[PDB]
Amino acid sequence: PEQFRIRRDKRARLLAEGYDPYPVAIERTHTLAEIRATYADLPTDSATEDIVGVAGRVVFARNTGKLCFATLQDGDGTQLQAMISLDEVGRESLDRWKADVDIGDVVYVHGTVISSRRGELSVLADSWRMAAKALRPLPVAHKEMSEESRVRQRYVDLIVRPQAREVARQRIAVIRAVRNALERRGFLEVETPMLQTLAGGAAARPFVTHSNALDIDLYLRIAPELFLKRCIVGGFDRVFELNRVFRNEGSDSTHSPEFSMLETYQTYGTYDDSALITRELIQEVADEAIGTRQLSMPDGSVYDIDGEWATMEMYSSLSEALGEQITPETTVARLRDIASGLDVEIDNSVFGHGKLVEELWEHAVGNKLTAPTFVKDFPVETTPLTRQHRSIPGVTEKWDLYVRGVELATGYSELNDPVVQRDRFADQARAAAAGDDEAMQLDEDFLTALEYGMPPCTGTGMGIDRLLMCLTGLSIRETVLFPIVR
């Protein structure tokens, strides 16, 4: 509060003296990266006659008697030296540089591109001008900022930490690579509503808001699934949506209340066809955005996502890990007895054959996975929107993709039978009567869409934040520019 006061008085002083501290219409001829690219092969002590007008943030400054030096940093992080010389700008201008410019200020420097005696690419200024007065100083080093401080002040983090910039450009590139992978395969991107009168498509608690236009309660979407399927009925052959979803989770990590989600739907394909596309897409995104399929991790290890990935069935692989065959006909009592013998804590809310089989598979198989693995053929009780298997009874055609031990993507053979889909919702109602506040409510308008006939299709889902976690090992609080904070 004392450092801020000195800079505030300096700003007020400049404004009164006529020196605009936040001027408008400053013309910048080059970005600092353009200056470094053009004169990269410039001799050590040479000097050009090229006039440039550059602007950047002063991050280092050192003043001598007649000659002042300053390191300007552009937004991307490119640095360039500015030389304010007594012979070049005059005494009155040089004195203002020492009195007015502090670390963090944005300044405009107009002069000639030279290379200092030490071979530093510099701008020999003939004029300088304040572009944005900084009332608060920059941190001394990015190591001094905690992680919660980077989240609360991402704007400061992007200035002082080069990796903060890299991750930001990385997310933009990964999302860009996901779209290119889907457009190469003929998928079109549509927009489905985010405010919905009934929020279906997933098992999650929704955010509720009141609409004054409609005088009813609206729900933030938990998934675009039910509206993307209406697009399939309408005639979209290959469709996807890469945008935000909202899930009202409570005191649970790895999942944020708001995250970006990719859902794709493709007609006349099964969950086998979407599993192949999902693997090729992830591997293509790694090539385009990361540059390798040998993913470097923060702990120094290297993770391999190349090649073909293993596939296993849930009931079959769970039976191998337990030594006892588990089938859809296995009783809930038998599953609870196996869990008690393994010292596994069934989370009170978990009940039923399907949820218990999934919890046992996660403990006995899922958590021990390291390489990318597909697990397919799920219990029918826990996959209401998934078509039943061709031959195997009691299971549905769904796969979950595990990369580095984390659930990354999921794919269905979509249930298009409207009579069976209504039966699944009746089973969801009975689960809701038992205490499951995440069960899916019956969406009548969605069933009406299926009753006009939906072609067979396969649908996928994958969180972008989860994808960034697999490719870079960084949590959602690092790959999102402004994560939510109290």
Ligand SMILES: N[C@@H](CCCC[NH3+])C(=O)O
């Ligand atoms: N709606 C699913 C995504 C996959 C949909 C497959 N038909 C979810 O939220 O997990």
